[PDB]
Amino acid sequence: EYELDVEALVVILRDRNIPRNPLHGEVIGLRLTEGWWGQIERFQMVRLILQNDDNEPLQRPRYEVIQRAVNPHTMFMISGPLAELQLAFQDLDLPEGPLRFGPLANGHYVQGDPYSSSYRPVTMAETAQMTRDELEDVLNTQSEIEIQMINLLELYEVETRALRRQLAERS
Amino acid sequence: VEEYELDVEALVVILRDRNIPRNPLHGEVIGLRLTEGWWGQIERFQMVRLILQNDDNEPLQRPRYEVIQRAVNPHTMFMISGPLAELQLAFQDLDLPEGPLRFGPLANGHYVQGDPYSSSYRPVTMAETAQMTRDELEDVLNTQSEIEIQMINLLELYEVETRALRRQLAERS
Amino acid sequence: PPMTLQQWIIW
Amino acid sequence: MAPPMTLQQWIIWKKMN
């Protein structure tokens, strides 16, 4: 659980023209377009905490980190650079392991999907911050992603061969 | 120094079965292509040096081989292909090398379109990762990430290739 | 009673 | 020192003793 600046979050929402009004205990997905790790999209799932357990307002609001993969299609999503989102979400950083891949934390690479097109692997800056279990989970996920990528490259090579053939005989 | 036992007679059987006419020397480096093993039915690479005789060149009663931490280059080296269980008869207790070295031609992460060994390349399995240390994992991940960059570039190139090809096919109907 | 961001800000 | 050995040379040697 870390500090949450409500005022800055409101500004962040309005700048994106989002008419949404998030609640207390609201689960929000974040698409970090860039950060210290370079300029490649990463994900993090947070929860807003405005009050206590008895619903009395906290004069110092918080947000907690939920350890789950962000699903951009079924979840409320804010996108933007880390620096900008840190104005609201204080000390915000990448989540543990493959979770940082978001919709690809489970290693599901889909042809035609923009989130699969935007996916980039871990940098050596990221790995220096990871534990062994963390590093294994990332490597397992990247392996699954690669398997899909290799199958997709064979399919491409087969279709390209077939289309050049069809073009040759119809030209 | 990592040294294990070598069955010379088994190695002769293996070379002859693969129609390799020449016999390797003491201190010669052998590049091995492991076509399958415990990891899976995916191809892996290991490098070995033969030890047939001692320091005075007196023949060893029990010959050995040593594992060399270097990536195999199948283009320039003496090569033996086969399943692990067949090569374990000659090279006793043969296993995978440390880190990305197992990828052989792609231990350096140099992925190329049209390269046979790039096409044969497969990433590590869950059995492999369970056995690795932190440094191994970080090394493998570094290499596989560079291979991914290359693969992503080829995917976007194939998407443009396919698209422009379908366009020229459509205008000709 | 769950609050919104505006419901907290006017407080 | 003797020269480096081939595989067969070793096998032939082992067949001696």
Numbering used by the authors:
A (entry chain A): 9 to 179
B (entry chain B): 7 to 179
C (entry chain G): 3 to 13
D (entry chain F): 1 to 17
From the paper:
Moreover, in all retroviral subfamilies Gag carries out the same functional roles including assembly, nucleic acid packaging, transport to and budding through the cytoplasmic membrane of the producer cell as well as trafficking through the cytoplasm of the target cell and uncoating. Here we report the crystal structure an amino terminal domain from the Gag of PFV (PFV-Gag-NtD), provide the molecular details of the interaction of this domain with the N-terminal leader sequence from the PFV Envelope (PFV-Env) and demonstrate that the PFV-Gag-NtD is also the target for Trim5α restriction factors. Our data reveal that the FV Gag is unique and structurally unrelated to the Gag protein of other retroviruses.
It seems likely that FV Gag becomes associated with Env through interaction with Env leader peptide (Env-LP) displayed on the cytosolic side of the ER and Trans-Golgi network (TGN) after core assembly at the pericentriolar region. Env then directs the intracellular transport of the assembled particles to enable mature viruses to bud at the PM or sometimes into intracellular vacuoles. This interaction guarantees Env incorporation into virions and the loss of either interacting domain (Gag-NtD or Env-LP) results in the intracellular stranding of assembled FV capsids. To better understand this interaction and shed light on how FV Gags recruit Env, we examined the interaction of the PFV-Gag-NtD with the PFV-Env-LP using SV-AUC. The affinity of the interaction, 1.5×105 M−1, is comparable with the value of 0.65×105 M−1 reported for the interaction of residues 1–30 of the FFV Env leader peptide with the equivalent Gag-NtD. Therefore, the hydrophobic interface observed in the structure likely represents the complete interaction between the leader peptide and FV Gag. In order to probe the importance of the interactions in the Gag-Env interface observed in the crystal structure a series of serine and asparagine substitutions were introduced at Val14, Leu17, Val18 and Leu21 to make the Env binding site progressively polar. In addition, in order to examine the contribution of the α1-β1 loop to the Env interaction a conservative Asn29 to Gln substitution was also introduced. Mutations in the Env binding site of PFV-Gag-NtD have been shown to affect viral assembly, egress and infectivity.
